[PDB]
Amino acid sequence: LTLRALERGDLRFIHNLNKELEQPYESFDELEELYNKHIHDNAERRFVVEDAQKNLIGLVELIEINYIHRSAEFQIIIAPEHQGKGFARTLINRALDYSFTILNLHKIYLHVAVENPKAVHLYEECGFVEEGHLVEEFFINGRYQDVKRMYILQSKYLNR
Amino acid sequence: SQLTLRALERGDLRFIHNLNKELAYMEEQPYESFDELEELYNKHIHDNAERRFVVEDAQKNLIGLVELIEINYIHRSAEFQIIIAPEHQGKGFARTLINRALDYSFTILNLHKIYLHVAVENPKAVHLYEECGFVEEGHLVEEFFINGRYQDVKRMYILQSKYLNR
Amino acid sequence: SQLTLRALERGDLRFIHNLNKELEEQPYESFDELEELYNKHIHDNAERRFVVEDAQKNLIGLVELIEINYIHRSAEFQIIIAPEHQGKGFARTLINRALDYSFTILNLHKIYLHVAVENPKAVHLYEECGFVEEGHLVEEFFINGRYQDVKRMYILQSKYLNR
Amino acid sequence: SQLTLRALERGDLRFIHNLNKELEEQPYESFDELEELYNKHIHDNAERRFVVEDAQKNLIGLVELIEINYIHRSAEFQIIIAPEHQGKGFARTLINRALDYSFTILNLHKIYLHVAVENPKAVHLYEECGFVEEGHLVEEFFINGRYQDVKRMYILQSKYLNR
Amino acid sequence: SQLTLRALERGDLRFIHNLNKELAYMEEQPYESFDELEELYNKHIHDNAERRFVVEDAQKNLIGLVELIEINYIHRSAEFQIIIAPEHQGKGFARTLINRALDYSFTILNLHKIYLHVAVENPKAVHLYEECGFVEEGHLVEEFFINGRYQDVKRMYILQSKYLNR
Amino acid sequence: LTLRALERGDLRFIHNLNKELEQPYESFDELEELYNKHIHDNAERRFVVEDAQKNLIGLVELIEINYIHRSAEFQIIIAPEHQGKGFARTLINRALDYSFTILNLHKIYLHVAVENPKAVHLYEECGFVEEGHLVEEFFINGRYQDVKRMYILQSKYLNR
Amino acid sequence: LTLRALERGDLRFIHNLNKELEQPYESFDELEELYNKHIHDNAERRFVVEDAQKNLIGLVELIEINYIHRSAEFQIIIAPEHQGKGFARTLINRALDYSFTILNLHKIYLHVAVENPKAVHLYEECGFVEEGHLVEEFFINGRYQDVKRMYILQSKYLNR
Amino acid sequence: LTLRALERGDLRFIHNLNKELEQPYESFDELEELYNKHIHDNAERRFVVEDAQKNLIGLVELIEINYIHRSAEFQIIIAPEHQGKGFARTLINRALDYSFTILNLHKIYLHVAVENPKAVHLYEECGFVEEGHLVEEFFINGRYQDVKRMYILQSKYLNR
Amino acid sequence: SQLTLRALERGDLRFIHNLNKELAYMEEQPYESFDELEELYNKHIHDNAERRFVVEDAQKNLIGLVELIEINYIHRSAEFQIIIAPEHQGKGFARTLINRALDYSFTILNLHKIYLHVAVENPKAVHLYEECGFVEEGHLVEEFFINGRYQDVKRMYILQSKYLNR
Amino acid sequence: SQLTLRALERGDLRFIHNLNKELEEQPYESFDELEELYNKHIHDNAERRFVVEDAQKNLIGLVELIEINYIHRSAEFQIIIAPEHQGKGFARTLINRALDYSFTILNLHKIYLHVAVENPKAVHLYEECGFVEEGHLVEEFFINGRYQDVKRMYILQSKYLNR
Amino acid sequence: SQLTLRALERGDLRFIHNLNKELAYMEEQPYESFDELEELYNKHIHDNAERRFVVEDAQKNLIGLVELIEINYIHRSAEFQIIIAPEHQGKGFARTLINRALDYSFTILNLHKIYLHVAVENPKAVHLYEECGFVEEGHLVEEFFINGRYQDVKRMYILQSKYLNR
Amino acid sequence: SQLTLRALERGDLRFIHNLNKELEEQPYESFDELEELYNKHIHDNAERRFVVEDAQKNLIGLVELIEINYIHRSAEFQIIIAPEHQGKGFARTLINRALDYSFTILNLHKIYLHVAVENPKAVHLYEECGFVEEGHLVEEFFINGRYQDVKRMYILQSKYLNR
């Protein structure tokens, strides 16, 4: 599985990929114009993961890149077809590899719903550690829910 | 739930234009130009004060349109509008799309109040929204000029709390 | 009749341009000027340009409302019928179709129009359609190498709604 | 009274900004946003913002018409009086001054407005000025850490002109 | 002829704004914003379809305004408008400025017809224009909404040939 | 033969038509962009003359339209194929008909090389009269040449 | 002490106010142009606190306003002259009052350096509660430092 | 008397100077904006004539400059104060001097009302010769009038 | 005269780009990007200070290019440049296109002087222009850097009077 | 060899993008950023980007000159060879082709470049091509999760022209 | 530490222009136009790749300028430049402003490496930077053309780790 | 002399405009054209316009470099001296000041200029300043109603640096 930069040609597929069960209700024209607005935005990175047969496995994103503090929020989404194939670990470390060996970032953090303990333990297996329990951070499905903020530092990923 | 909501996009504007030409019809200007419709659409792609959703079935046959306009994020309110093609008006899709819109308004968009305007001389629509949980909060006197005469319209609402509590 | 009032859009300008060549400067208007001027008035709420067609999508004519005031609730009505259907009897149909839109939808109070004094049959046709002379504009327009008079005829909303 | 209805212009925004600080988000609005938003609506025919003042150029209040439709001929009326003249009895004067403009100049058919249900004296004042309740909007606005109800009251042109 | 016509310019807009606030007054919107007046002026500086002239006396005391709008260069027609400050309305300047405008229209601008609209309920203005050579060509029924009622207005004209021939 | 307004679609043909023996050396891109600049120019009129089978006979133009003086310069060009067919008279009066009966102009003038006495007499047959002999007005083919300025008024054309 | 919206006229004072011991090294022209860019930005609020004699006490800011989740980050800065006068509590609740009674927000969170336990306890007195301990979040004075993320909800502030 | 290029500072004076007995009825804002539009217009020249005490005597203009035919229309206007002082001859030859010795033009022509025989003879004294009698060219004071088109060539002015 | 001059246009830019890649070659930057060539062309469509002409035969086979740059309309001067594809360099088209350009410069554009620059180390071109009427007016020392060394170039001219008089 | 130095144009960006994916951030660069950044530098006289290809139009590599000063007449030279032809011996050919353009056409005085200290064979190849070490930049770039040193090597016009 | 760093702003450009006219002077173009300086400044107000700081004393007497250019946020590097008015060049302010810039680079901006270029024929500056912790990493041969001859320049650096560890 | 070479900026255009009125079209150039053309070339690296002044800020003249190539490293030098100091002996000073900038700062290779053949003293002055005739342009410029010849004189960097 390779890590490629997302380009305008991939927007149609991710638009249908977002439709899972905010983003599912986004107009494609808004998605495209917003993509055009962030072409040169150095504060974000949008990568599409594909296999040898150029099949879109998922999307890994880095947002809120600071460069002074050298931190960035991490996000990942895998198409329903490839959820249970065990790609998550590979894509996570693939994004951490780019963040710590190429972009030279110091910290990578992410948010996960407290009501998804399987996802929490997954990131724990990839090296992430809980640093916060945000109370009623996001309003998800008719109710406010807590989310875990988990992080991992450059030194730890490099000294595995 | 065999129908699906989907964000309106440029490719559907031609369908919307032909759809707005109804005779059943509370539609003010079915005599709008497609170019005015398209350009006005382009001006509201990033308008976070509205949400327009196309309704389509399993085979992607565009059924109708559901809209949330005048979205105020301090008062957590928004006006609701819905139109269904005359071909499927009798198949009972309305109350499904009404409840689907309310679900998005109250569970995703986190709105507090959803209101709508209905012509008093359309009791079929009034009683329908009542079944879907809407309650009358106003009887606007001579609010809209419709077919050569001023007519009254009901303003009806539904609150987030009531919807999220059976 | 089984005619419909559709909004003029860019896709019809080509047919309108060829139709404008009748026997105004419009017959001698470049299509590029017609299209660019159309684009400039797409959001001009002071005008309305509707294409009238039958069930077979055949363009019968073009009805227009201009100089819409919205305070005085008046507007100038103009009409043109394709040379093919000029004497078929659609004029009265499209006229009452334009008055129906003006008085039952746009909620206007007065619809006026100009008719060449040198066209008595046209003046008397509008009178049969409810219009009434309110002015005899002397040498208002220069038409065919000669200044001509035009009748200004009007119709009020109350009169049309209480037929 | 000897009050006059003047058009709000850029030269008054500073006074309006200080006046907006009462006890809406307007009290907490940056003047730069007020001025730039004013510039964007200079040609917005769907709104009217008039400054009401006396013979001595003293600003008594600000009357506004918004959501003007021109097809339905309706508009929302809003009013604010400077804290100095709130209990002096100008409210009824400026209200009938706004209805005079709406019904004798702009030729509107209906003027409606929202009044907090928690302000009975205000609701009954508009009723004395000819308005009538047509709606009781439940939890329409979030005011002072609490959703409040508002009365929607209207007045028709025919009623105001035949006093 | 002690008065002088002069092309309107930005510096006179403030006077025009205060002037339009008349009570004598056929002025539709004396409640216009000075900013709307100024910006609309800037948009018509090169509009060859209008001519706006400020009237001033020997000491450059701006008396009023004379306008030619809707100038059509194929039909050689234009609408005429005039306003005089309430201070000098009774000094008979009107017929002087009316004939001065007609002179510019027919001897300089080379127009063929000059028309104007007058409220039927203002006979003082109607008979005044008649004296200046204007003739009635129309009695427009309920043309303008004025002070809570639709009112008729006279449309009156004068031709270049008649003016240039005593 | 009908009188039609020139549109962007006719530019390619007139570009080749101009190549006869200034304009012959004009870039098509300049011709098109200049045409775009004068779409709404009320001071000029560009008409293409065509037959029943929509064949471009020539081009008649009105430039320097004043509207105060109600004058305009007249120009005409016929493709080499239709020069000797006697269309010139028809197109000239066709342009005069539009100028005097539709556009309501007062005077129509034109310039013709003094070394083209056949063209001078042609316009004399169509009603034009010499009003000037401009000395060395234009530099044509390596030498300055005189041109006749000929005119015709609205009253004369209407009272034939 | 009143809460007023920051306007272009106050930029010069806050520029000197920022100079305390990132922002202290910002060009005034950048500060002004960035202020012009966020005039209509509904995702932030910039308020200046002033006393009865219109003296700039400090600045309270709300950023990252969501409106769907109804959360926003809170920031406050008091001029060195008025630090020890005990205004912090008033300004904090003044900003919470605007967020919960006017803007109708649900959650207000903030970040404080773990090496500032006095500030932590202050927000604890104003109703804030720790929800996270971000490890090496910010690089402050030649070293990465931890910060506490503290929050307070609308229901709690209203039901005091 | 010196020949200076007209700049925006002189617009107010010429505006009042134009008011004599089209231009007298021009708005100053139109005059200024039109001046701004022709700053770099190489097809025209606008010169103001002034005396030793920098008093605006008049204005001489060259318009319709061709550069291929090397022709240009000449125009002159003297303030009423200096009409009878005999400056016209000087300013005329001053403009001809610039046209033939600096701008390297070939022909200079002008239009004069036939009902101004004194002006016609003046240009005849300065070297101009009648080349046309334009019938009813301009509509002046309620009637169409004829005008003389008079010219003078570069070789003649240089070989005086 | 079987060849024909024709105004350069966008459609010929690709040919010009491939043509400029000569090895025979006094062409400074044959390593120019087609996009730079096209955009620079778009910026000079209305530049009246240059004239670029494509040369084509009866079958419209683009032979080469003839240019007039630095056209000054006060001094009536312009620089002349010409390039012929290596395929037809030996067929003697040069002196035909040189005389065709001079004809346009002196009989149509009405220029007074046409000059050009030639590398001293290209006597074939120098003597060719001499035959076409050009005369040397300067031997510019180390004017251009060409292939790792500064080289001299001849500046040669021809006047309108001489050309128009056999 | 029978290679040619062609100017990089928009038609090649797609091939370059796929070629940039080697084993810099360029492999992870969106094509839209590559194309828009290319458009912004079409007229940037401080850079040169040439495509090197053979007679069969096969892209062998890409030579670049950046930071061109024109007062100091210096520029940084960069080179990349397609993975297919990396060990075929084109490196020395394209290097001397870039020096020929810099010194015999653009008339530059000095050409420098950076070479990873962890690539001795590369440093010694440039030395064989006439370059000479003038700097050992300590921890200049962060490459592969580690700050690496780079040799800065230069070559003067006079030396290349007098081989 | 009586001096203070402060972000450059438009009001100081005139001082910078007069300051750049040095004779002591490694300044390439002291013949730059103030308008070019001002417009170039306006184009880099939001350029996060540079940091320009004006130095002033207690009484706000602008002493000199300190710059960080070519700031790369992946490699955490930046070039350092400094200029002090000839009036205070001998008062030893340099090493204070050098260490103040390094402090901002390593403790606030969190940079990893700070390098600079110095003319070999200015040993006073070379040895000064050495005292401030800079170390030579390159002797660039004929790097800059200075006063009619190509001259060498030292490239010297200092790392964040060394600076933050006594 | 104690003269200095300063960059021409907008603040001097007024003085330059009055100075341009000497005995080119510049004397007859509108100041607005001078200022707007100046703005368009503020970042034009192909030109240089320096004001030469003494210690008392008195403008002695204006030296200019145009048509700067940077590949061929050539440029046209132009000079003008205020009528007040034309015969005072500053010409040779400003000429060598312009050559010093061209050859010791901008690193140009050749400086050429045009001198009217009808001004022998000027041609011989440049020859004394190191220039040499390389062309006799026949009827290059139309000056004072007559086409005049101009000498094109040059000077190389190597010659000026090795005086």
Numbering used by the authors:
A (entry chain C), F (entry chain C), G (entry chain C), H (entry chain C): 5 to 25, 33 to 171
B (entry chain B), E (entry chain B), I (entry chain B), K (entry chain B): 3 to 26, 30 to 171
C (entry chain A), D (entry chain A), J (entry chain A), L (entry chain A): 3 to 25, 32 to 171
The authors write:
SpeG is an SSAT protein found in a variety of bacteria, including the human pathogen Vibrio cholerae.
R1C1 replaces all residues of this region with the hSSAT1 protein sequence, R1C2 replaces the first half of the residues, R1C3 replaces the first three quarters of the residues, and R1C4 replaces the latter half of the residues of this region. Alternatively, when the first three quarters of the loop or latter half of the loop residues were substituted (R1C3 and R1C4, respectively), the enzyme activity decreased by 52-fold for R1C3 and no activity was detected for the R1C4 construct. A more drastic decrease in catalytic efficiency was observed for the R1C1 construct (two orders of magnitude compared to WT) compared to the R1C3 construct (one order of magnitude compared to WT). Based on the kinetic results, it became clear that the region of the allosteric loop that was critical for activity was between residues 31–34 (WFEE). The investigation of alterations to Region 1 of the VcSpeG protein (R1C1-R1C4) showed we could replace residues in the first half of the allosteric loop (R1C2) and retain moderate activity, but exchanging residues in either the second half of the loop (R1C4), the first three quarters of the loop (R1C3) or the entire loop (R1C1) caused the enzyme to be inactive. Therefore, residues within the WFEE portion of the allosteric loop are critical for activity, but we do not know whether all residues or only a subset of these four residues are required for activity toward spm for the VcSpeG enzyme.
